[PDB]
Design a binder for this molecule. Structure first.
Ligand code: HEC
Ligand code: HEC
Ligand code: HEC
Ligand code: HEC
Length: 107
């Protein structure tokens, strides 16, 4: 597959941009986030046209916000869904991984 980015990359929303760092996720399988689409591999941007291209709505499969922040039952793992579990085991990282403000995602 392509080489994983070695510097934080930009995850553009409609107003905010959150930097995503691959290094701390080196042990997570690529497919967990870059999930298969139509049975095929894809490393395209999450908010690509035809993917999670609704950058303003809070819900719906097309909502980038939803695929990122939902803790609900999803077809794939969201950032918050996994972070909740990590935080359950490492409570000292609650603010860093799940905070809406002053977190590692939203400083
Ligand atoms: C606490 C539970 C949080 C609240 C409430 C919000 N976030 Fe986040 N967030 C993250 C990413 C990767 C993005 C960019 C992609 C996108 O969702 O569009 C954002 C963006 C926002 C936004 C603005 C949405 C927009 O610009 O269209 C809002 C209002 C927002 N977030 C609220 C990632 C993360 C993250 C990293 C794991 C955490 C802990 C949070 N966000 C927490 C919250
Ligand atoms: C979730 C925790 C992830 C894991 C595990 C991996 N990647 Fe990733 N990657 C993820 C995001 C949120 C982003 C930003 C996409 C965006 O919306 O901008 C990326 C980006 C990439 C890219 C660059 C594509 C691009 O954004 O233009 C590549 C080439 C990439 N990721 C590769 C990759 C590989 C090979 C992985 C496993 C070793 C891998 N990623 C894991 C989220 C996640
Ligand atoms: C288009 C080629 C896509 C890219 C690139 C990414 N996603 Fe996706 N995602 C896409 C579809 C067609 C679907 C529906 C389910 C399916 O697998 O066919 C999804 C689903 C998700 C989900 C679950 C959403 C739900 O409502 O259950 C999540 C959590 C999700 N996608 C996350 C995600 C992330 C973080 C991506 C970037 C690394 C990403 N997707 C890329 C289509 C596409
Ligand atoms: C589990 C399968 C994960 C998914 C999906 C996402 N993240 Fe993650 N993240 C995970 C771990 C194991 C860690 C490290 C915790 C530790 O023990 O130290 C992280 C860390 C981050 C961080 C913090 C890095 C730092 O600055 O210290 C960020 C900012 C982060 N993760 C972002 C992020 C985003 C935006 C995701 C969705 C695209 C995402 N993570 C998914 C585990 C998992």
């Amino acid at each position: 597959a392509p080489a994983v980015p070695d510097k934080p990359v930009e995850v553009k929303g409609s107003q905010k941009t959150v930097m995503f760092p691959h290094a701390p996720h080196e042990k997570v399988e690529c497919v967990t986030c870059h999930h298969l689409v139509d049975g095929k591999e894809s490393y395209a941007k999450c908010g690509s046209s035809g993917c999670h291209d609704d950058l303003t709505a809070k819900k719906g499969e097309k909502s980038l916000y939803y695929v990122v922040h939902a803790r609900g039952e999803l077809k794939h793992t969201s950032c918050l869904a996994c972070h909740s579990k990590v935080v359950a085991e490492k409570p000292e990282l609650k603010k860093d991984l799940t905070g809406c403000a002053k977190s590692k995602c939203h400083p």
